[model samples]
Target: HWGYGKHNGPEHWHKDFPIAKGERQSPVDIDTHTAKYDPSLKPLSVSYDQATSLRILNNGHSFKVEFDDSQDKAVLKGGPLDGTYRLTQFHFHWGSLDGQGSEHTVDKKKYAAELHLVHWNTKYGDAGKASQQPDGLAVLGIFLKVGSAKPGLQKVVDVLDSIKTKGKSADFTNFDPRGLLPESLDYWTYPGSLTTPPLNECVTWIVLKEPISVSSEQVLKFRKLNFNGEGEPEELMVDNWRPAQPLKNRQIKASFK
Candidate 1:
Protein backbone atom coordinates (compact mmCIF):
# COMPACT_ATOMS: atom_id res chain seq x y z
CA HIS A 1 0.00 0.00 0.00
CA TRP A 2 1.13 3.59 -0.60
CA GLY A 3 2.10 5.69 2.39
CA TYR A 4 2.90 9.32 3.22
CA GLY A 5 6.57 8.72 3.89
CA LYS A 6 9.80 10.00 2.43
CA HIS A 7 9.95 7.11 -0.05
CA ASN A 8 6.29 6.46 -0.94
CA GLY A 9 5.11 10.03 -0.44
CA PRO A 10 3.35 12.33 -2.95
CA GLU A 11 6.65 13.47 -4.39
CA HIS A 12 7.31 9.97 -5.70
CA TRP A 13 3.72 8.96 -6.52
CA HIS A 14 4.08 9.91 -10.19
CA LYS A 15 6.97 7.47 -10.49
CA ASP A 16 4.52 4.61 -10.03
CA PHE A 17 1.23 6.07 -11.23
CA PRO A 18 1.72 8.39 -14.17
CA ILE A 19 -1.69 9.99 -13.60
CA ALA A 20 -0.36 11.41 -10.35
CA LYS A 21 1.33 14.06 -12.49
CA GLY A 22 -1.83 14.76 -14.49
CA GLU A 23 -3.29 18.23 -14.77
CA ARG A 24 -6.37 17.47 -12.65
CA GLN A 25 -4.64 16.23 -9.51
CA SER A 26 -6.41 16.78 -6.17
CA PRO A 27 -5.73 18.66 -2.91
CA VAL A 28 -4.98 21.87 -4.71
CA ASP A 29 -4.59 25.22 -2.97
CA ILE A 30 -7.75 27.32 -3.19
CA ASP A 31 -6.98 30.95 -3.85
CA THR A 32 -10.22 32.59 -2.68
CA HIS A 33 -9.34 35.96 -4.17
CA THR A 34 -9.08 34.43 -7.62
CA ALA A 35 -12.04 32.06 -7.23
CA LYS A 36 -15.00 33.13 -9.30
CA TYR A 37 -18.24 33.81 -7.43
CA ASP A 38 -20.98 32.04 -9.35
CA PRO A 39 -24.54 33.13 -8.59
CA SER A 40 -25.87 30.27 -10.69
CA LEU A 41 -24.49 27.62 -8.36
CA LYS A 42 -27.29 25.91 -6.44
CA PRO A 43 -27.27 25.17 -2.73
CA LEU A 44 -25.95 21.73 -1.84
CA SER A 45 -28.48 19.15 -0.72
CA VAL A 46 -27.07 16.54 1.65
CA SER A 47 -29.34 13.87 3.10
CA TYR A 48 -27.64 11.15 5.11
CA ASP A 49 -29.26 8.59 7.39
CA GLN A 50 -27.39 7.77 10.56
CA ALA A 51 -28.37 4.12 10.23
CA THR A 52 -26.60 3.81 6.87
CA SER A 53 -23.25 4.00 8.69
CA LEU A 54 -22.08 0.39 8.85
CA ARG A 55 -18.56 -0.27 10.11
CA ILE A 56 -15.35 1.66 10.74
CA LEU A 57 -12.19 0.25 9.18
CA ASN A 58 -8.54 1.19 9.70
CA ASN A 59 -7.11 0.92 6.17
CA GLY A 60 -3.48 1.56 7.22
CA HIS A 61 -3.46 4.95 5.58
CA SER A 62 -6.53 6.26 7.41
CA PHE A 63 -9.68 5.16 9.21
CA LYS A 64 -12.94 5.33 7.29
CA VAL A 65 -16.60 4.79 8.12
CA GLU A 66 -18.15 2.81 5.31
CA PHE A 67 -21.77 3.49 4.44
CA ASP A 68 -24.47 1.28 2.92
CA ASP A 69 -24.64 2.86 -0.53
CA SER A 70 -26.84 0.18 -2.08
CA GLN A 71 -29.60 2.73 -2.35
CA ASP A 72 -29.79 6.50 -2.38
CA LYS A 73 -29.90 6.44 1.41
CA ALA A 74 -27.10 8.96 1.96
CA VAL A 75 -26.82 11.23 -1.05
CA LEU A 76 -25.49 14.59 -2.22
CA LYS A 77 -26.91 16.74 -5.01
CA GLY A 78 -26.63 20.27 -6.39
CA GLY A 79 -23.65 22.63 -6.20
CA PRO A 80 -21.90 21.96 -9.52
CA LEU A 81 -23.32 18.45 -9.63
CA ASP A 82 -25.79 17.21 -12.22
CA GLY A 83 -26.83 13.85 -10.73
CA THR A 84 -27.07 12.51 -7.21
CA TYR A 85 -23.87 11.07 -5.71
CA ARG A 86 -24.27 8.28 -3.21
CA LEU A 87 -22.10 8.41 -0.11
CA THR A 88 -19.72 5.44 0.07
CA GLN A 89 -17.41 6.40 2.92
CA PHE A 90 -16.05 9.27 4.96
CA HIS A 91 -12.50 9.59 6.28
CA PHE A 92 -9.97 12.12 7.54
CA HIS A 93 -6.41 13.41 6.97
CA TRP A 94 -4.34 15.08 9.65
CA GLY A 95 -0.78 15.73 10.75
CA SER A 96 1.11 15.23 14.03
CA LEU A 97 0.50 18.88 14.90
CA ASP A 98 -2.16 21.60 14.63
CA GLY A 99 -0.40 23.89 12.16
CA GLN A 100 -0.65 21.72 9.05
CA GLY A 101 -2.33 18.50 7.88
CA SER A 102 -5.16 19.32 5.48
CA GLU A 103 -4.93 18.19 1.86
CA HIS A 104 -6.40 21.34 0.37
CA THR A 105 -5.15 24.69 1.64
CA VAL A 106 -6.92 28.03 1.34
CA ASP A 107 -4.67 30.84 0.14
CA LYS A 108 -1.64 28.72 1.08
CA LYS A 109 -2.80 28.61 4.74
CA LYS A 110 -2.85 25.13 6.27
CA TYR A 111 -5.41 23.72 8.73
CA ALA A 112 -5.15 21.18 11.53
CA ALA A 113 -7.01 18.51 9.57
CA GLU A 114 -9.55 17.70 6.87
CA LEU A 115 -12.63 15.47 6.51
CA HIS A 116 -13.48 13.83 3.20
CA LEU A 117 -16.91 12.41 2.44
CA VAL A 118 -16.43 10.22 -0.62
CA HIS A 119 -19.31 9.69 -3.00
CA TRP A 120 -19.89 8.12 -6.40
CA ASN A 121 -22.32 9.23 -9.07
CA THR A 122 -25.43 7.03 -9.16
CA LYS A 123 -25.57 7.49 -12.89
CA TYR A 124 -22.55 5.20 -13.23
CA GLY A 125 -24.32 2.39 -11.32
CA ASP A 126 -21.21 1.28 -9.42
CA ALA A 127 -18.31 3.07 -7.73
CA GLY A 128 -15.64 0.94 -9.38
CA LYS A 129 -17.06 1.67 -12.82
CA ALA A 130 -17.70 5.30 -11.98
CA SER A 131 -14.13 5.79 -10.91
CA GLN A 132 -12.91 5.27 -14.46
CA GLN A 133 -15.17 7.95 -15.91
CA PRO A 134 -14.46 11.66 -15.82
CA ASP A 135 -17.67 12.57 -13.93
CA GLY A 136 -17.82 9.66 -11.54
CA LEU A 137 -16.73 10.71 -8.05
CA ALA A 138 -17.52 13.71 -5.87
CA VAL A 139 -15.60 14.31 -2.65
CA LEU A 140 -16.74 16.87 -0.07
CA GLY A 141 -13.89 18.32 1.97
CA ILE A 142 -14.46 20.02 5.35
CA PHE A 143 -11.53 21.65 7.14
CA LEU A 144 -10.76 21.01 10.82
CA LYS A 145 -9.24 23.51 13.25
CA VAL A 146 -7.91 23.34 16.82
CA GLY A 147 -10.45 24.92 19.12
CA SER A 148 -13.24 23.97 21.58
CA ALA A 149 -14.10 20.26 21.50
CA LYS A 150 -16.78 19.41 18.99
CA PRO A 151 -19.42 17.26 20.67
CA GLY A 152 -20.53 15.72 17.39
CA LEU A 153 -16.98 14.68 16.53
CA GLN A 154 -16.49 13.12 19.98
CA LYS A 155 -18.60 10.18 18.87
CA VAL A 156 -16.14 9.50 16.04
CA VAL A 157 -13.12 9.98 18.29
CA ASP A 158 -14.47 7.49 20.81
CA VAL A 159 -14.28 4.75 18.19
CA LEU A 160 -10.60 5.46 17.58
CA ASP A 161 -9.78 3.42 20.68
CA SER A 162 -11.40 0.31 19.21
CA ILE A 163 -9.71 0.54 15.80
CA LYS A 164 -6.29 1.75 16.95
CA THR A 165 -4.28 -0.62 14.75
CA LYS A 166 -4.21 -1.16 11.01
CA GLY A 167 -6.61 -3.76 9.55
CA LYS A 168 -8.74 -3.42 12.72
CA SER A 169 -12.45 -2.79 12.39
CA ALA A 170 -15.55 -2.69 14.56
CA ASP A 171 -19.27 -2.20 14.18
CA PHE A 172 -20.18 1.50 13.98
CA THR A 173 -23.66 2.76 13.34
CA ASN A 174 -26.43 5.30 14.09
CA PHE A 175 -24.02 8.15 13.49
CA ASP A 176 -25.24 11.11 11.45
CA PRO A 177 -22.61 12.35 8.99
CA ARG A 178 -24.31 15.77 8.85
CA GLY A 179 -23.29 16.50 12.41
CA LEU A 180 -19.69 16.79 11.18
CA LEU A 181 -20.44 19.71 8.87
CA PRO A 182 -19.94 23.42 9.50
CA GLU A 183 -22.58 26.18 9.73
CA SER A 184 -21.92 27.58 6.32
CA LEU A 185 -22.63 25.46 3.26
CA ASP A 186 -20.64 27.88 1.15
CA TYR A 187 -18.05 25.94 -0.88
CA TRP A 188 -15.56 26.06 -3.72
CA THR A 189 -16.10 23.67 -6.60
CA TYR A 190 -13.49 22.39 -9.03
CA PRO A 191 -12.46 19.25 -10.94
CA GLY A 192 -9.73 17.15 -9.39
CA SER A 193 -8.53 13.57 -8.76
CA LEU A 194 -8.37 11.32 -5.75
CA THR A 195 -5.65 12.37 -3.30
CA THR A 196 -4.45 8.79 -2.97
CA PRO A 197 -2.89 6.38 -5.41
CA PRO A 198 -4.34 5.57 -8.85
CA LEU A 199 -5.17 9.29 -8.56
CA ASN A 200 -8.16 8.98 -10.87
CA GLU A 201 -9.36 12.23 -12.42
CA CYS A 202 -13.04 11.62 -11.76
CA VAL A 203 -13.86 13.79 -8.74
CA THR A 204 -15.92 16.96 -8.68
CA TRP A 205 -14.35 18.61 -5.65
CA ILE A 206 -16.70 20.48 -3.31
CA VAL A 207 -14.67 22.03 -0.53
CA LEU A 208 -16.41 23.81 2.37
CA LYS A 209 -15.13 27.26 3.25
CA GLU A 210 -15.92 27.21 6.98
CA PRO A 211 -13.88 24.97 9.26
CA ILE A 212 -15.23 22.93 12.18
CA SER A 213 -13.41 22.86 15.52
CA VAL A 214 -11.95 19.92 17.41
CA SER A 215 -9.97 20.32 20.62
CA SER A 216 -6.20 19.86 20.58
CA GLU A 217 -6.63 16.92 22.94
CA GLN A 218 -8.95 15.19 20.49
CA VAL A 219 -6.35 15.75 17.79
CA LEU A 220 -3.85 13.74 19.83
CA LYS A 221 -6.09 10.68 19.73
CA PHE A 222 -5.81 10.57 15.94
CA ARG A 223 -2.07 10.17 16.23
CA LYS A 224 -2.49 7.23 18.61
CA LEU A 225 -3.55 5.14 15.64
CA ASN A 226 -0.93 2.67 14.39
CA PHE A 227 -0.13 2.23 10.74
CA ASN A 228 1.14 -1.33 11.22
CA GLY A 229 -1.04 -4.30 12.02
CA GLU A 230 -0.89 -6.77 14.93
CA GLY A 231 2.59 -8.30 15.62
CA GLU A 232 4.16 -5.86 13.16
CA PRO A 233 6.57 -3.07 13.95
CA GLU A 234 4.48 -0.14 15.11
CA GLU A 235 4.60 2.87 12.83
CA LEU A 236 3.02 6.01 14.22
CA MET A 237 0.21 7.31 12.03
CA VAL A 238 1.10 10.96 11.56
CA ASP A 239 1.36 13.23 8.54
CA ASN A 240 -0.95 10.89 6.60
CA TRP A 241 -1.91 13.72 4.27
CA ARG A 242 -0.75 14.51 0.78
CA PRO A 243 0.83 17.81 -0.11
CA ALA A 244 -1.15 20.40 -2.11
CA GLN A 245 -1.03 19.80 -5.85
CA PRO A 246 -0.73 22.41 -8.58
CA LEU A 247 -4.05 23.92 -9.73
CA LYS A 248 -2.99 24.04 -13.40
CA ASN A 249 -5.78 25.73 -15.37
CA ARG A 250 -8.80 24.70 -13.27
CA GLN A 251 -11.27 27.39 -12.16
CA ILE A 252 -12.60 27.22 -8.61
CA LYS A 253 -16.25 28.29 -8.51
CA ALA A 254 -17.61 29.62 -5.24
CA SER A 255 -21.24 29.05 -4.28
CA PHE A 256 -21.44 32.31 -2.32
CA LYS A 257 -19.81 35.70 -1.93
Candidate 2:
Protein backbone atom coordinates (compact mmCIF):
# COMPACT_ATOMS: atom_id res chain seq x y z
CA HIS A 1 0.00 0.00 0.00
CA TRP A 2 2.99 2.33 0.42
CA GLY A 3 4.11 4.13 -2.76
CA TYR A 4 5.41 7.46 -4.00
CA GLY A 5 3.38 10.02 -5.93
CA LYS A 6 2.27 12.45 -3.28
CA HIS A 7 2.32 9.42 -1.01
CA ASN A 8 4.98 6.71 -0.41
CA GLY A 9 7.77 4.74 -2.10
CA PRO A 10 10.92 2.79 -1.12
CA GLU A 11 11.31 5.33 1.65
CA HIS A 12 8.32 3.65 3.34
CA TRP A 13 8.22 0.03 2.05
CA HIS A 14 8.32 -1.30 5.62
CA LYS A 15 4.87 0.13 6.45
CA ASP A 16 3.16 -1.86 3.68
CA PHE A 17 5.37 -4.88 3.04
CA PRO A 18 6.79 -5.29 6.53
CA ILE A 19 9.48 -7.71 5.40
CA ALA A 20 10.81 -5.26 2.82
CA LYS A 21 14.06 -4.66 4.64
CA GLY A 22 15.25 -8.27 4.36
CA GLU A 23 14.15 -9.13 0.82
CA ARG A 24 16.60 -10.12 -1.96
CA GLN A 25 15.93 -7.96 -5.05
CA SER A 26 16.68 -8.64 -8.73
CA PRO A 27 17.01 -7.19 -12.27
CA VAL A 28 20.32 -6.00 -10.94
CA ASP A 29 22.19 -4.19 -13.70
CA ILE A 30 24.97 -6.69 -14.37
CA ASP A 31 27.90 -4.60 -15.60
CA THR A 32 29.79 -7.28 -17.57
CA HIS A 33 32.85 -5.52 -18.93
CA THR A 34 33.89 -4.34 -15.46
CA ALA A 35 33.24 -7.68 -13.75
CA LYS A 36 35.69 -10.56 -13.48
CA TYR A 37 35.55 -12.97 -16.38
CA ASP A 38 37.28 -16.31 -16.88
CA PRO A 39 37.93 -17.83 -20.28
CA SER A 40 36.57 -21.15 -18.96
CA LEU A 41 33.06 -19.88 -18.09
CA LYS A 42 30.36 -21.74 -20.00
CA PRO A 43 26.59 -22.38 -19.93
CA LEU A 44 25.04 -25.18 -17.84
CA SER A 45 22.90 -27.96 -19.31
CA VAL A 46 19.31 -28.63 -18.15
CA SER A 47 17.43 -31.92 -18.56
CA TYR A 48 13.67 -32.10 -18.12
CA ASP A 49 11.22 -34.93 -17.56
CA GLN A 50 8.99 -36.23 -20.33
CA ALA A 51 6.35 -33.58 -19.76
CA THR A 52 7.24 -30.21 -18.35
CA SER A 53 4.36 -28.49 -16.59
CA LEU A 54 4.01 -24.78 -15.74
CA ARG A 55 1.74 -23.84 -12.83
CA ILE A 56 0.78 -20.25 -11.97
CA LEU A 57 -0.19 -19.09 -8.48
CA ASN A 58 -1.61 -15.94 -6.87
CA ASN A 59 0.92 -14.87 -4.30
CA GLY A 60 -0.94 -11.79 -2.99
CA HIS A 61 1.40 -9.36 -4.76
CA SER A 62 1.91 -11.05 -8.11
CA PHE A 63 1.40 -14.23 -10.11
CA LYS A 64 3.82 -17.05 -9.31
CA VAL A 65 4.42 -20.51 -10.78
CA GLU A 66 5.72 -24.02 -9.96
CA PHE A 67 7.07 -25.97 -12.91
CA ASP A 68 6.82 -29.71 -13.29
CA ASP A 69 9.26 -32.08 -14.97
CA SER A 70 9.64 -31.55 -18.72
CA GLN A 71 12.24 -32.36 -21.32
CA ASP A 72 12.05 -28.91 -22.85
CA LYS A 73 13.97 -27.16 -20.06
CA ALA A 74 16.57 -24.70 -21.45
CA VAL A 75 20.05 -25.52 -20.27
CA LEU A 76 22.97 -23.17 -20.88
CA LYS A 77 25.55 -25.79 -22.01
CA GLY A 78 27.79 -25.54 -18.87
CA GLY A 79 29.01 -22.98 -16.34
CA PRO A 80 28.72 -23.46 -12.57
CA LEU A 81 25.51 -25.35 -11.90
CA ASP A 82 25.49 -29.16 -11.63
CA GLY A 83 22.74 -31.76 -12.24
CA THR A 84 19.28 -31.12 -13.71
CA TYR A 85 17.17 -28.37 -12.11
CA ARG A 86 13.47 -27.93 -12.65
CA LEU A 87 12.05 -24.47 -13.27
CA THR A 88 9.39 -23.60 -10.73
CA GLN A 89 8.02 -20.08 -10.53
CA PHE A 90 8.09 -17.26 -13.03
CA HIS A 91 7.59 -13.71 -11.75
CA PHE A 92 8.44 -10.08 -12.44
CA HIS A 93 9.53 -6.99 -10.51
CA TRP A 94 8.23 -3.57 -11.62
CA GLY A 95 8.22 -0.05 -10.33
CA SER A 96 5.12 1.06 -8.46
CA LEU A 97 6.27 4.62 -7.89
CA ASP A 98 8.04 5.29 -11.18
CA GLY A 99 6.66 4.93 -14.70
CA GLN A 100 9.90 3.22 -15.77
CA GLY A 101 9.94 -0.35 -14.37
CA SER A 102 12.77 -2.71 -13.33
CA GLU A 103 14.44 -5.02 -10.79
CA HIS A 104 17.90 -5.68 -12.27
CA THR A 105 20.18 -2.99 -13.69
CA VAL A 106 23.12 -3.10 -16.09
CA ASP A 107 25.80 -0.42 -15.84
CA LYS A 108 23.21 1.55 -13.79
CA LYS A 109 20.67 1.57 -16.63
CA LYS A 110 17.15 0.42 -15.66
CA TYR A 111 14.79 -1.34 -18.03
CA ALA A 112 11.02 -1.53 -18.50
CA ALA A 113 10.87 -4.77 -16.45
CA GLU A 114 12.84 -7.78 -15.17
CA LEU A 115 11.73 -11.37 -15.43
CA HIS A 116 12.93 -14.06 -13.02
CA LEU A 117 12.98 -17.63 -14.22
CA VAL A 118 13.08 -19.55 -10.92
CA HIS A 119 14.54 -23.03 -10.94
CA TRP A 120 15.17 -25.50 -8.14
CA ASN A 121 18.08 -27.91 -7.90
CA THR A 122 16.50 -31.14 -9.08
CA LYS A 123 19.17 -33.17 -7.31
CA TYR A 124 17.30 -32.23 -4.13
CA GLY A 125 14.11 -33.88 -5.44
CA ASP A 126 10.77 -32.27 -6.37
CA ALA A 127 10.05 -28.55 -6.21
CA GLY A 128 8.56 -28.81 -2.69
CA LYS A 129 11.54 -30.68 -1.31
CA ALA A 130 14.03 -28.50 -3.19
CA SER A 131 12.56 -25.29 -1.79
CA GLN A 132 13.83 -26.42 1.60
CA GLN A 133 17.36 -26.81 0.30
CA PRO A 134 18.67 -23.29 -0.12
CA ASP A 135 21.61 -24.46 -2.21
CA GLY A 136 19.28 -26.30 -4.54
CA LEU A 137 17.94 -23.37 -6.51
CA ALA A 138 19.14 -21.35 -9.51
CA VAL A 139 17.62 -18.25 -11.03
CA LEU A 140 18.14 -16.76 -14.48
CA GLY A 141 17.61 -13.03 -14.80
CA ILE A 142 16.33 -11.49 -18.05
CA PHE A 143 15.94 -7.77 -18.68
CA LEU A 144 12.94 -6.45 -20.57
CA LYS A 145 13.61 -3.40 -22.70
CA VAL A 146 11.03 -1.18 -24.39
CA GLY A 147 10.82 -1.81 -28.14
CA SER A 148 8.47 -3.38 -30.67
CA ALA A 149 8.00 -7.11 -30.01
CA LYS A 150 9.32 -9.96 -27.87
CA PRO A 151 8.06 -13.21 -29.32
CA GLY A 152 9.34 -15.10 -26.32
CA LEU A 153 7.23 -13.23 -23.74
CA GLN A 154 3.96 -13.04 -25.67
CA LYS A 155 2.57 -16.23 -24.11
CA VAL A 156 2.97 -15.00 -20.54
CA VAL A 157 1.49 -11.56 -21.27
CA ASP A 158 -1.43 -13.07 -23.13
CA VAL A 159 -2.52 -14.77 -19.91
CA LEU A 160 -2.62 -11.55 -17.89
CA ASP A 161 -6.37 -11.22 -18.47
CA SER A 162 -6.90 -14.63 -16.92
CA ILE A 163 -5.24 -13.44 -13.72
CA LYS A 164 -6.24 -9.79 -14.06
CA THR A 165 -6.58 -9.31 -10.28
CA LYS A 166 -4.68 -10.11 -7.14
CA GLY A 167 -5.16 -13.63 -5.74
CA LYS A 168 -6.71 -14.57 -9.05
CA SER A 169 -4.74 -17.14 -11.08
CA ALA A 170 -5.82 -19.29 -13.98
CA ASP A 171 -4.76 -22.87 -14.60
CA PHE A 172 -2.63 -22.61 -17.72
CA THR A 173 -2.40 -26.16 -18.95
CA ASN A 174 0.04 -27.06 -21.75
CA PHE A 175 2.16 -24.04 -20.97
CA ASP A 176 5.71 -24.31 -22.32
CA PRO A 177 8.29 -22.12 -20.59
CA ARG A 178 10.99 -23.05 -23.15
CA GLY A 179 9.60 -20.40 -25.43
CA LEU A 180 10.76 -17.73 -23.01
CA LEU A 181 14.43 -18.68 -23.33
CA PRO A 182 16.59 -15.96 -24.83
CA GLU A 183 17.99 -16.57 -28.31
CA SER A 184 21.50 -16.61 -26.90
CA LEU A 185 22.02 -19.33 -24.30
CA ASP A 186 25.34 -17.72 -23.42
CA TYR A 187 25.18 -16.26 -19.89
CA TRP A 188 27.19 -14.77 -17.05
CA THR A 189 27.18 -16.77 -13.81
CA TYR A 190 28.13 -15.99 -10.21
CA PRO A 191 27.28 -16.65 -6.57
CA GLY A 192 24.56 -14.22 -5.53
CA SER A 193 21.69 -14.00 -3.06
CA LEU A 194 17.98 -14.11 -3.71
CA THR A 195 16.38 -10.81 -4.69
CA THR A 196 13.13 -11.43 -2.87
CA PRO A 197 11.93 -11.76 0.71
CA PRO A 198 14.02 -14.02 2.96
CA LEU A 199 16.83 -12.92 0.69
CA ASN A 200 18.77 -16.15 0.87
CA GLU A 201 22.39 -15.99 -0.27
CA CYS A 202 22.44 -19.36 -1.97
CA VAL A 203 21.62 -18.75 -5.60
CA THR A 204 23.70 -19.34 -8.74
CA TRP A 205 22.63 -16.19 -10.56
CA ILE A 206 22.92 -16.75 -14.34
CA VAL A 207 22.06 -13.47 -15.98
CA LEU A 208 21.99 -13.28 -19.77
CA LYS A 209 24.20 -10.58 -21.19
CA GLU A 210 21.79 -9.84 -24.01
CA PRO A 211 18.36 -8.38 -23.27
CA ILE A 212 15.17 -9.01 -25.24
CA SER A 213 12.79 -6.27 -26.31
CA VAL A 214 9.05 -5.82 -25.86
CA SER A 215 6.69 -3.23 -27.26
CA SER A 216 6.33 -0.08 -25.17
CA GLU A 217 2.56 -0.62 -25.36
CA GLN A 218 2.91 -4.19 -24.07
CA VAL A 219 4.72 -2.83 -21.06
CA LEU A 220 1.75 -0.57 -20.42
CA LYS A 221 -0.50 -3.63 -20.61
CA PHE A 222 1.62 -5.40 -17.99
CA ARG A 223 0.97 -2.42 -15.77
CA LYS A 224 -2.75 -3.12 -16.10
CA LEU A 225 -2.59 -6.37 -14.13
CA ASN A 226 -4.45 -5.92 -10.86
CA PHE A 227 -2.28 -5.49 -7.82
CA ASN A 228 -5.34 -4.72 -5.69
CA GLY A 229 -8.05 -7.33 -6.20
CA GLU A 230 -10.64 -8.76 -8.59
CA GLY A 231 -13.15 -5.91 -8.40
CA GLU A 232 -11.00 -3.00 -7.34
CA PRO A 233 -9.86 -0.66 -10.07
CA GLU A 234 -6.96 -2.35 -11.82
CA GLU A 235 -3.89 -0.49 -10.63
CA LEU A 236 -0.91 -0.12 -12.92
CA MET A 237 1.76 -2.52 -11.67
CA VAL A 238 4.41 -0.23 -13.05
CA ASP A 239 6.86 -0.02 -10.20
CA ASN A 240 6.78 -3.16 -8.10
CA TRP A 241 10.51 -3.62 -8.69
CA ARG A 242 13.29 -3.57 -6.10
CA PRO A 243 16.63 -1.89 -6.53
CA ALA A 244 19.82 -3.93 -7.00
CA GLN A 245 21.63 -4.76 -3.80
CA PRO A 246 25.36 -4.60 -3.32
CA LEU A 247 27.54 -7.37 -4.75
CA LYS A 248 28.97 -7.63 -1.23
CA ASN A 249 32.62 -8.78 -1.00
CA ARG A 250 31.91 -11.85 -3.07
CA GLN A 251 33.58 -12.27 -6.43
CA ILE A 252 30.87 -12.42 -9.13
CA LYS A 253 32.78 -14.53 -11.67
CA ALA A 254 31.65 -15.41 -15.17
CA SER A 255 32.39 -18.05 -17.85
CA PHE A 256 32.93 -17.81 -21.63
CA LYS A 257 35.75 -18.83 -23.98
* Structural similarity to truth (TM-score) of each candidate: 0.98, 0.80
> How many clashing residue pairs appear in each of the predictions shown?
0, 34
lDDT of 2 at 184: 77
Off by over 4 Å in 2: 1-28, 46-51, 70-77, 96-99, 132-134, 231-234
Candidate 2, residue 112: Cα displacement in angstroms equals 1.0
lDDT of each candidate versus the true structure: 0.92, 0.63
Of the candidates shown, which would achieve the greatest lDDT relative to the real structure?
1
Q: Point out where model 1 deviates above 4 Å.
A: none
Query: Model 2, 137-230: lDDT tens per residue?
Result: 7888877777768775677777777777777767666666666556775677666656544445556788777777877666666777766676
Give me the overall lDDT of model 1.
0.92
